[PDB]
Amino acid sequence: DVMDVMNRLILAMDLMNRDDALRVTGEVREYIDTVKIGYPLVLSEGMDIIAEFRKRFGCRIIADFKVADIPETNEKICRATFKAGADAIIVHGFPGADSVRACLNVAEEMGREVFLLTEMPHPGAEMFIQGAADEIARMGVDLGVKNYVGPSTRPERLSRLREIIGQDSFLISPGVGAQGGDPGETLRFADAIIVGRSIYLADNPAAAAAGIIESIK
Amino acid sequence: DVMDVMNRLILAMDLMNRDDALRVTGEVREYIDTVKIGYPLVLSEGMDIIAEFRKRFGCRIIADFKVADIPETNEKICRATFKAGADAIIVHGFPGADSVRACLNVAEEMGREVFLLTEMPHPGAEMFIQGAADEIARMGVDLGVKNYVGPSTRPERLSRLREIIGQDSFLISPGVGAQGGDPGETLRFADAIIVGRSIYLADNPAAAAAGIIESIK
Numbered sequence A, B: 001d002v003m004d005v006m007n008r009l010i011l012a013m014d015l016m017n018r019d020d021a022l023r024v025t026g027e028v029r030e031y032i033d034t035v036k037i038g039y040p041l042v043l044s045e046g047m048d049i050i051a052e053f054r055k056r057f058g059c060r061i062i063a064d065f066k067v068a069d070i071p072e073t074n075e076k077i078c079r080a081t082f083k084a085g086a087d088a089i090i091v092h093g094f095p096g097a098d099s100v101r102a103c104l105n106v107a108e109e110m111g112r113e114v115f116l117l118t119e120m121p122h123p124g125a126e127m128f129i130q131g132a133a134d135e136i137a138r139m140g141v142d143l144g145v146k147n148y149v150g151p152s153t154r155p156e157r158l159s160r161l162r163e164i165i166g167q168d169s170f171l172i173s174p175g176v177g178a179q180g181g182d183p184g185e186t187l188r189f190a191d192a193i194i195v196g197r198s199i200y201l202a203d204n205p206a207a208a209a210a211g212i213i214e215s216i217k
Ligand SMILES: O=c1cnn([C@@H]2O[C@H](COP(=O)(O)O)[C@@H](O)[C@H]2O)c(=O)[nH]1
Pocket: A012, A014, A038, A064, A117, A119, A120, A121, A122, A149, A150, A151, A174, A175, A176, A177, A178, A179, A194, A195, A196, A197, A198, B069, B070, B073
C-alpha cells in the first residue's frame, strides 16, 4: 500500500542549525512520526543529519530536495540521498519524464519512495508551474508514481490533482499556515499536511502542533 | 562587467568522492580557473568541499544546485551556499519571478552571482522546459539577471537565447560532449562551455581538456 503518517501531520523542519532543529523536533516528537528535511538544514549541517533524525526520533524522513536536474545527475542525487538514510525524496516533474524515471529507478532499486511535486503554493508558481501541473500529475500516474505533493494554497487545484491521481495515490500538501493554507480544507483531498514555520517558529511549538491536530480531530 | 573564465572552459566536476574529484581537477588545473560543483559531490562529501576547491586550486566555484523552491527556502539555500564560499549559484527560472528574486536578493547582499537556467539539454526538457525557455530568459532580462545557462544540445535555441539576453549578458552552456553538444558550435553564442564526463571520465583528463581547448583555438 502507501505509507502511514501519524496524525496525518508532517513536520517541515527548515531550521538551519542542528541544535534548534533537534530541540524543536524533540518538543513535538509525540505528535508526528514523519519529518520533511530540506536543503536549508542539510546544506548547513551535513547529510548526516538525516540519519541522526531517524535514530533520535525513530521517524520517517522525506528529503525535500526538489530534484530538478538531467537524468544522470538526478540518479546520483537520489542515490546519495537514500544512502544517507532518507526514506523518500521529493522530485520536480517540470524537467520531464526521463528525469523522473531516473529517480524512480534508484528508489525501486533501494526500496525507497519518490514523491512527485506537481504544483507549488507560492505566487510565482502561476507563471509556468500551474499550467503544466495537470500534465505533470498525469505523467506521474502514467509512470506508476504513487506519491505526490500538491499546493494547499489552491484547494481547487489540489482537488483537481486528486482527481487525476486517483483515490489510491498518496498525496501530501505544503503551504499550510505561513503560506495561508488551511489544515482542514487541505485534508479534504490530501492524505497528510506539511507544516513548517507555523510550528518551528512558534514560541511554543508543542502547543502549535497540538492546536493544529485539535483543529483536525 | 561580467566574470572572466579562463580558456572559456568550465569544468563540471560531478565525481562523488573527494579524492577522485580533487585528483582529476588537479590534473586539469592548468587549463581552467572556474569549476562547477553540483549536488552529487556536495551531498556525498559535504559543503566544505567548496572552500577546499577554492583554496587548493584558487578557482571560481559555481554551485550547480538548480535552486527550485519557494522564495523563503530559495533565500536560505543561497545564503548557506554563499556562506560556504560559492562565487555563484545556478537557479531554475520555472518556479517564477519571486523565486528568482529571492536568490538575487541574497547574491546582491553578499556580493555573489546568480546564473539563471533557461532551458536544459536532456530529451525531457522538451516536455515543459523548452516551451517556457524564451519567457524565462525574458524574465531574467527584465529583472536585471546578467548570467545565464543555456543548452548546447540545441544551438538554434541557444542562438535564440543569446538574442533575448543581449550581447552584454554572460552565457555558459552545458551538454557539451557526453550529451552530444559541440564545443565550437556552442561558443558561437556562449561565452564559456561546460564540460563534465568528457573530461573527468576520460582515461587521460589532461589530454581530454587539452584536446577540447585545441579544437577551440
Ligand atoms: O510545493 C512545495 C514543495 N515544498 N515546499 C516546502 O515545504 C515547506 C513549507 O514550509 P512552511 O510551512 O514554513 O511554508 C518548506 O520546506 C518548503 O520548501 C513548499 O512550500 N511547496
